[PDB]
Amino acid sequence: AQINVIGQNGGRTIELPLPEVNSGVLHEVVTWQLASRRRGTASTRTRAQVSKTGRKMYGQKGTGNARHGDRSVPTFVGGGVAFGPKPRSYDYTLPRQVRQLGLAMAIASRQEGGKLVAVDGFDIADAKTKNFISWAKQNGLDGTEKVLLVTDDENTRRAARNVSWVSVLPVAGVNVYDILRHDRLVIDAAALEIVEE
Amino acid sequence: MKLHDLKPTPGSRKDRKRVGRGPGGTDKTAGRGHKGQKSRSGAGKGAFFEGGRSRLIARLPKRGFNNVGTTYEVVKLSQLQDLEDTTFDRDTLEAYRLVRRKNRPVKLLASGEISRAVTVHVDAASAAAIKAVEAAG
Amino acid sequence: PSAGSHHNDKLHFKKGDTVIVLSGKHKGQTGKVLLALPRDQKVVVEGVNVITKNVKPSMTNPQGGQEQRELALHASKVALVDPETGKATRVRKQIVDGKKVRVAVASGKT
Amino acid sequence: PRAKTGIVRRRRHKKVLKRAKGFWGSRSKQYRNAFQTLLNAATYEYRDRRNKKRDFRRLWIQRINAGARLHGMNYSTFINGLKRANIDLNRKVLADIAAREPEAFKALVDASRNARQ
Amino acid sequence: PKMKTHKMAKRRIKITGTGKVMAFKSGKRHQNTGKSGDEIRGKGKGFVLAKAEWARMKLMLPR
RNA sequence: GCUGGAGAUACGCUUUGACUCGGGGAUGUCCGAAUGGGGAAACCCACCUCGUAAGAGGUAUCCGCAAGGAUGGGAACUCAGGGAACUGAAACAUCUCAGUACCUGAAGGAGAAGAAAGAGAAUUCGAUUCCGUUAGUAGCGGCGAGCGAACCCGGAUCAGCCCA
RNA sequence: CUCAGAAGGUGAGAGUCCUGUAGGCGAACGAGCCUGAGUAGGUCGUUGUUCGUGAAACGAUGACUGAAUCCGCGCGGACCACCGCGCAAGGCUAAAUACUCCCAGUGACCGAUAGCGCAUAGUACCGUGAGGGAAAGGUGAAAAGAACCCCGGGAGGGGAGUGAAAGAGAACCUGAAACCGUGGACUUACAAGCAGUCAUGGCACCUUAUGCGUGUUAUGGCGUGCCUAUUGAAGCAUGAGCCGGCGACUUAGACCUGACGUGCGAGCUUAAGUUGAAAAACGGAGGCGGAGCGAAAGCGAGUCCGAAUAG
Ligand SMILES: [Mg+2]
Ligand SMILES: [Mg+2]
Ligand SMILES: [Mg+2]
Ligand SMILES: [Mg+2]
Ligand SMILES: [Mg+2]
Ligand SMILES: [Mg+2]
Ligand SMILES: [Mg+2]
Ligand SMILES: [Mg+2]
Ligand SMILES: [Mg+2]
Ligand SMILES: [Mg+2]
Ligand SMILES: [Mg+2]
Ligand SMILES: [Mg+2]
Ligand SMILES: [Mg+2]
Ligand SMILES: [Mg+2]
Ligand SMILES: [Mg+2]
Ligand SMILES: [Mg+2]
Ligand SMILES: [Mg+2]
Ligand SMILES: [Mg+2]
Ligand SMILES: [Mg+2]
């Protein structure tokens, strides 16, 4: 339901679902996204069983001390940890329909204020970043807003020097997180609305 | 949008029971009452006279058909219901079993459905609406 | 133990060269490079000075004295100069000493 | 992630130790004994907040029938006769203070003695 | 995992639709013949009361 | 520039390119599988040949005619011979822990296994291995505690070659 | 400026001061008629496989025995016939698999009682031995590491000087608490005490602070530590010298069963893996609704008992 930019034009239309971003739909997609990448790298040696320490220190009875039996246990300084973190997974399969629904609500929430559609190419001389900065300045991308960019030609991204600017993705790299993370979204107008099926 | 203004749907998330941790709730004993309730847990379907101890009458095998009530079959509006292996039915328990149509409701219309077997009266209600059914031969 | 210099043990100047401090006290001051210490990253120059009272050991000096001596710095005196100020510099070309590269900034050699 | 006790225990502990102030001996300088002292101090606090009102009732009563007997009456008698006289409904606090202003308490005694003959 | 206890299999339980637990009728099941005709005839119910939860967890899928 | 950590003074080396880095050679006492002989590891005693001596080289057993090969070592992994109990069964013999622990042997960068006298009930498949799944199904069981497949199907990888 | 905003360093935080895979180049010469007999088969003792002697096939064997060969031989879970699948008694065989002494990168891992036992040591120390086995970090930006002077044999200190700072001085960041002391306010030598609490007077001070308190104190009232365990705890029942730090309801699995929430909804979802990773997509093998009754055949809105009537 939104228009275009420089390389050409379009007057583009497509249906946008009502965003549940602040709702659990977008919030769920973001949480699944961050959790999916987790490294599970918590290995404490904590279990009494790998602390490297001995046998049976002294007398079960009649020494006048406290009772203990080995030196490898959570009550002992130096021993293991009860219930220490172990390496593990964190990843799970969020339902697919919620994936696509989230990403669509993402795009949508940006169309409600400030999304932009790069029309079948920008003019950037060679690959020089300075001309990207000129191009974006002439498309109203100040120096201010953090912005995300999606495209496919190598060169236009090869002005991908984030300077409080230019977080960069190709096609299919899109994700609810990376767009929701930025203010304006400079979506690549082409496959930006090549309708599925 | 506001990544700080993402809000989980109220409900959904609920906090874990942190057990030990104070006479502000669930103190010394951790919801366990002073008992022969102690770490290394042991049992779930057992007392000692057992009483799931009644006697048994035993067959080993079984085999059964995929079910196709004709009621959905008849309101279909597209008649001559010979299923390609994929479509509509058997999604649960599809390719491992055989089909058998049965005399759940009716709507009356012509239709030639070719299930692997069928109830005697689905022939009654299918042939009565001028409708063949090809049991495999 | 903390490890030494991380500058790939590479000094950016010879013991011959003139140089200027560009930071701290002595900024703008200039001198010859009386001692280069790459692996520890330290630079002797006639700029910084310090009054070292060596403790009297009677080693020809029963009662000790206070010497005036220059105390070394590191990669904070700026490299060579030419338009009268410090400069970034670039590898150059061959000369009549054609086995050598020289240096330059927005200019000539050193 | 680890999450050791760090700052938290020392701060609760200092809160108790500062409640301690002029507590004799370890009661004010060792944490555990300060905490435990404050348990029993809770007991004393709440109950005394109740009791003080029994206390001042008792004191006003003492003074009131002291004054009542200065004139040949007594608390039972003076309080009842005042009650019989178009219910005065002065508090027992207030009747004391009029036992600091004798000329009035006197007339209250004559008035109670009236509504009683 | 969570295996079902095979002792409950052909043993007098079965799962009625609507989630109720089956059982068989036991007393004088075998080795008794001064029992009355109806008594020998009395087996075959399986409606069974406040045990059901445990009988259910005896059989996950109704084997 | 260097002159090891070392934070130390003195002697110095380096445009003939030191130092540091990448690569090869050469030197490498004595002990250790140790192996000339012995031995309480690093030591004590010899014999044969070459040599002016000083010094150099040889001297264990087991396969081989011979070239040549083997002794020993190696975190965990692999195969193999041998092989527990605590423990569960609310006691305990069968059963379980469990072919786990441990010992021993053999080897490599992996090993094992492998090319249907098969799987299996479609006259289907087409070496082996590993993953998913079937499935806690089929079964095994003081039919107790409990133990528990495979075929089909989806993937990783995919070769078959030589003998009597 | 930017194909280079990764990162470290530099007197506090540097895109442009230094070191820098963004990109680019790079070596002498160095890595990469036959077809298996003491066999198959068998009996005795045993065992693997879901295989506990069970109707127990089959493989594997320790003792004894012991055949056929293409109208031939093994197998299909006692066994027989038919039907069907194979060719033993000879060998070799990459890759998909496992592991981490070693190396690199990374981390909703640790950061000096944590993290390996070790900020390095299998040391010190303990044991004849096998074996066991510690704690321990921090000047400053830069040694400019305190010449000189004073008391002292020294140790230690006070000055001077360096330094932003010595409120960093080598017993060298912060520097809590228990514990020991000095000085000051208010106080105590007729007094019975879980040590507090309420009340009031006295004295003292006024930086969240002059009705306001804050600190202390005299006298009055009241008042049986904590926890655990228990019918019942001040208990002459357990535990504890004190403080600091360590210290206990977790993790897992396509497991199960509930509640809440979300996406689809008569339908709902993938796993192993493949391709891309500054991010995800693909992948219907399979799993769950969908029909029940029965011991099972099986029949099916019906199904079981039973000779049709009862449940
Ligand atoms: Mg004791
Ligand atoms: Mg540790
Ligand atoms: Mg609660
Ligand atoms: Mg208890
Ligand atoms: Mg336990
Ligand atoms: Mg009252
Ligand atoms: Mg599994
Ligand atoms: Mg049933
Ligand atoms: Mg040095
Ligand atoms: Mg020898
Ligand atoms: Mg030899
Ligand atoms: Mg020997
Ligand atoms: Mg037992
Ligand atoms: Mg071994
Ligand atoms: Mg070996
Ligand atoms: Mg396959
Ligand atoms: Mg600037
Ligand atoms: Mg045999
Ligand atoms: Mg046998």
Ligand SMILES: [Mg+2]
């Ligand atoms: Mg048995």
Ligand SMILES: [Mg+2]
């Ligand atoms: Mg047979």
Ligand SMILES: [Mg+2]
């Ligand atoms: Mg056999």
Ligand SMILES: [Mg+2]
């Ligand atoms: Mg058969």
Ligand SMILES: [Mg+2]
């Ligand atoms: Mg053959």
Ligand SMILES: [Mg+2]
């Ligand atoms: Mg941390």
Ligand SMILES: [Mg+2]
């Ligand atoms: Mg440590």
Ligand SMILES: [Mg+2]
């Ligand atoms: Mg410490």
Ligand SMILES: [Mg+2]
């Ligand atoms: Mg000793």
Ligand SMILES: [Mg+2]
């Ligand atoms: Mg010793």
Ligand SMILES: [Mg+2]
């Ligand atoms: Mg230092």
Ligand SMILES: [Mg+2]
């Ligand atoms: Mg002196």
Ligand SMILES: [Mg+2]
């Ligand atoms: Mg001194």
Ligand SMILES: [Mg+2]
């Ligand atoms: Mg000082």
Ligand SMILES: [Mg+2]
């Ligand atoms: Mg200090």
Ligand SMILES: [Mg+2]
């Ligand atoms: Mg100290």
